[PDB]
Amino acid sequence: SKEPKVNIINAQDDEVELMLSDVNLSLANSLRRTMLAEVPTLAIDLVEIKMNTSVLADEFISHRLGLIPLVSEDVEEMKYSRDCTCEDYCDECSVVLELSARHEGETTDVYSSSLIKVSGPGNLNVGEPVRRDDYDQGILLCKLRNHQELNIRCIAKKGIAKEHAKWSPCSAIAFEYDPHNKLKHTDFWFEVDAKKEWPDSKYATWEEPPKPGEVFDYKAKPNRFYMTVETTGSLKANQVFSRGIKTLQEKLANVLFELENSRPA
Amino acid sequence: GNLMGKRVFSARTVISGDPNLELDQVGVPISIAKTLSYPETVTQYNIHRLTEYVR
Amino acid sequence: LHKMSMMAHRVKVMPYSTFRLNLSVTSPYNADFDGDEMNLHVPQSEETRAELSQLCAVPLQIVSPQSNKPVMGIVQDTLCGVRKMTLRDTFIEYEQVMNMLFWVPSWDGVVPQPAILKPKPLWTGKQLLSIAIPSGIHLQRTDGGNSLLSPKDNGMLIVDGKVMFGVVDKKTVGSGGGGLIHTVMREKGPKICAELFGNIQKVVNYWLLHNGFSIGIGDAIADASTMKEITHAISSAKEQVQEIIYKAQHNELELKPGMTLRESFEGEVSRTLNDARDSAGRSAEMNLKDLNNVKQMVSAGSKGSFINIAQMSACVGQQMVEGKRIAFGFADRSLPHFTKDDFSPESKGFVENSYLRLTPQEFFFHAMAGREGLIDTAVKTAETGYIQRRLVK
Amino acid sequence: MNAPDRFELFILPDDVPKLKITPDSRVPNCIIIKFEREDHTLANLLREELALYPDVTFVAYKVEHPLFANFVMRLQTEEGTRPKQALERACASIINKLKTLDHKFNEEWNIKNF
Amino acid sequence: QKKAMSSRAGVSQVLNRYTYSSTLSHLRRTNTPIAKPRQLHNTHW
Amino acid sequence: SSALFDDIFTVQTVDNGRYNKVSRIIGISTTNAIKLTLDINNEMFPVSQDDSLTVTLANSLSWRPPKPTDKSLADDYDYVMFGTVYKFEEGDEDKIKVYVSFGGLLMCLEGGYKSLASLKQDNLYILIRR
Amino acid sequence: MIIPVRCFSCGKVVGDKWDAYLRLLEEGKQDALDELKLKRYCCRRMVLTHVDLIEKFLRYNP
Amino acid sequence: DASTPLRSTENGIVDQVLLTTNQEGLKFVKVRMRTTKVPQIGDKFASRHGQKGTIGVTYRHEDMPFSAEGIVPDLIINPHAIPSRMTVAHLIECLLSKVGSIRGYEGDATPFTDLTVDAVSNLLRDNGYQSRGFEVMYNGHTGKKLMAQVFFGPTYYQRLRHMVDDKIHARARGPVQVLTRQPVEGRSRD
Amino acid sequence: VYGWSSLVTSGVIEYVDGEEEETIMIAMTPEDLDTAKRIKPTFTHCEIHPSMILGVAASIIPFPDHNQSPRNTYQSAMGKQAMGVFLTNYNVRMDTMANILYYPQKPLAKTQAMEYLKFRELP
Ligand SMILES: [Zn+2]
Ligand SMILES: [Zn+2]
């Protein structure tokens, strides 16, 4: 259609390989990290333990749940507890959860599936124990014996990877460019032959080989980047790219907005 | 033991170098600065700032 | 134990639980960051402070009276990298030559005419690194084959405060005599020079942040054939020993006046293995290209030396205690794994192996040797302090 | 113990503008813009798109120190052309480039089966 | 005990419990009441 | 605003003593006593032994980016470095030789007929073609 | 001491994958990681190095 | 009063209280407090090679340098701690362990055996990466490749005790001694 | 029914003190006695295994035969200062100070000796 352009390669539900061309590396990279760190999500943040006979300590489990992946589809139509006019929390900015685990089966396990959603979802995709496990109980929270009990109560909130890793929906992201060092943005280490000793990348096939007879091209710039966007759940691999592309934009916006608020005076 | 040398407005912790500090600086943990003081007499040049620092 | 073991610093309140000090002011206190702790004292009178800033300020301390030369230079990363950035091969383009000039705080706000305009307008480290050097700074060097067009790019010449030629490393920016630092202090003052660090730093450290640098087993492996050429420099060296041992077990040698027939036997074995070992390493030294990272970290002058490479890629060396190769603790033998009266090197503690590749025996002797080392580093440590204390009182 | 609260990497604190623009005396027609609660993610992106307006005579940016999420951007342009504007433009060119991107990635996606 | 401090302190300590390999080590330890002894002798093999 | 040197030499040889991207070349003049020693970017401007290059100098046409597409272009060549010259040496007889360094790239010239052309200033633009 | 949710290094979840793994061993007698979808060593090392103490802790009474 | 106060530098949560008899039928009571301690910009660590070092700063994934695969370091130690320390096995454990990582097979490092650097390197080439470890990396701030390559590889690291917050101490006119009237000793007693 | 007590009651292994050692000849590698490996140079006894001259400390050090000896000697000390699990009953122990590493991890590389130092189960 217009400026920069995509050319998706084999894509699935937990990945999205694709080639991004006609963009400055500078800008590719920017988007790179934005996914890695600043996309709004939803994770447990406050845990109110009532009873706990597990061999694990309170805050150890607390940690665990912070990491358990929750739904974050319509995460954008929720507000940051910091902006919501409610003392502490509420349905309009949080998702409350329950967890009860009594040891009855004379090793009983606690999977993230065992979470209730006590607060009003207000009819919006969010707050669900993202399960991708084959059986149907993704993420073993913890195990417990005979009569050991355990009662919690979680409260999830918006937030991002900056604030905490328990947020970013990214989780590993591939990035490469100019597999054939033509731009010479590198000086290969070697004992005798760089080329033979250094693995050729699977990415070398969508770009033309070097060709000896040609002198060193200089005026050429870093164009085209072979990536791959893995997802942990919360947000669909596709969105973890869209939303990224967009938040970066929203920021670039206020830099122009904040600008305006300073001209009147 | 007590005269030619005594324990003495002092602090001590672990060092780690910082490549963005002028040669002569020395980063001090907020915690410490909020502990060590300095007797500055009130003077019509610093009254204003001191009355603020005090509040 | 120094006038410099205590210095007055500008306070900078920062977060996180630790005293954050500059690198170049490292060697005076002689600290590292493996857990080392630091004491801080706070002046209290208006003069107390002054007395601390007018005589103990770190900048005043740059030139040490004990050895009439500075005592703070550019260490590790900053040094190592400043070297790379200098080579004729090091070029930087506008985009970066800009973000580099920005990091120099004193920057006049003027981008210097490109060292190249023809096809692509580029600059060289030598150029930009120079934006850190104040006007009027004149420096002249001359190493080996150095002459007003230093072929191997040796020596160092800086006129008007612009690097003209030569590469920059320990020799040109270390706590040394000719030291560009030693000179900037003398010519500009405590202040100007004290700032000079941060700059030369900020530019370089930044640059390195992007050019990257590392080290790995690969930096310690010797050429396919060189690792052989050495083996047989130990074999032959082994026989030049078996030979003088045969010629001793026959009384076919005369006593060098003042030495025992036996002692004179050692005196040669020792001088044989040593010269062997000496080139064993030297074969690899010249076998490590101008890309070997370990070499690089040695030329820059930021860590290790020949010896090191040697013991890691070639031959570890001969082990020793009390000056003589591993004794005969066991009546007439090194280890119970040996035949009595074995005076050879494989018994007396000669580790023929390289770290990249010691045999029990070698490994042991080696320990007995190091053990002696550790000993005094744990004895001379406080007896030296007494002798010190006396001189004082 | 002495480390700040995480949320200080993006939230502006008590009376603080994202932007603070200061004129530079070192050379004519130049400015230094202090961006608060930001990083390379946004810095370098703005720095970049300015060496694009061949009307911009200079453009570098930097992070004073890593503990603090801020950064300074210095810009200088041709005669009688205000850099602030070039900042706007080069800033807008950025959104469009991305606006296009978002779109080109959505139609593209739909055409997938897996 | 008594007016007999003319003994040796060290015998019997407070078993380490920082790590497992810490405790093992502690038990397999030897002392030696006080430049040659500190050496690693051959006989030590 | 004038030129200070013009002469075609011939590459006597090209040396790369441990430099993946730079070579110090030497070549004598086609007219006169005049030798030339010059370091160069083998990457931007390749050169092998026996080449016909035209060397120039002089001072003229902060540092503005491009935009001069519609401006002067005293670049009628294929290599244009800027640098400074340091020493002014006399090699016996009345034969002179100035030393030019370009922010890191050394150079030497020899002969004797720019007794009123080659100045002792920092200014200096090198030019080359074909 | 239980399985670590999500890999330190990259972030990919890995809580569920415990039982799958400890199973593809005992029975299918097997590589396991590779099929469990644990590609790059960062997450690889995560599973392949976990020493599940919780089991022994669980062997304690009240 | 003879009541016990939580050490001034500390804090956490009570974890288990217990009452009990004494041989002398006295009331014995011990209290246990728990706390989770997080690694901080100063805490000490080290491998198994005298390669001890403390934290200087902490960056995140973006800021971190990386390799095409995605894989990013958890730790970044300086190439300078290698040349004079000479501890090379360190370098080897990494390589070996980068294979054992990929192969699932336990990597033996045990003393005098029949395993070599030349061997492991071949095993690492069968999996895909450089035969020496080194990998390409793109500078987390700009995305541009690193002119150099890095010795990127999984290595064991012990978290030695000795965390900053157990040492950080500062005083200004505190508890004075009795006999002398000078300050008192130790950070614990202020 | 074939312990170590039998390996000794059959004269297949002997307990050699330091004194008796003096008058015996010990062979290193049982067997033996490539351009990569380390160059190797009456017998009464052979060595169970050279990697047994090490004690608890070094036994956890990978390739101690590749580092500068004085370093091994250091790690030999820092180990007694790392974190992990010192027992499993720890949850029922009322001792002053004790630290447990949230999540342990047996090393990617190990010593055959570790197997007796229960290290794999108590990293
Ligand atoms: Zn609310
Ligand atoms: Zn991972």
Side-chain angles (χ1 to χ4, degrees), chain A residues 84 86 90-91 93:
Chain A
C84 175
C86 83
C90 77
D91 292 331
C93 74

Side-chain angles (χ1 to χ4, degrees), chain C residues 83 170-171 294-304:
Chain C
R83 165 180 166 295
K170 186 166 186 178
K171 304 164 208 162
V294 171
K295 178 161 186 174
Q296 289 180 291
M297 275 215 266
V298 179
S299 302
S302 59
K303 261 302 181 182

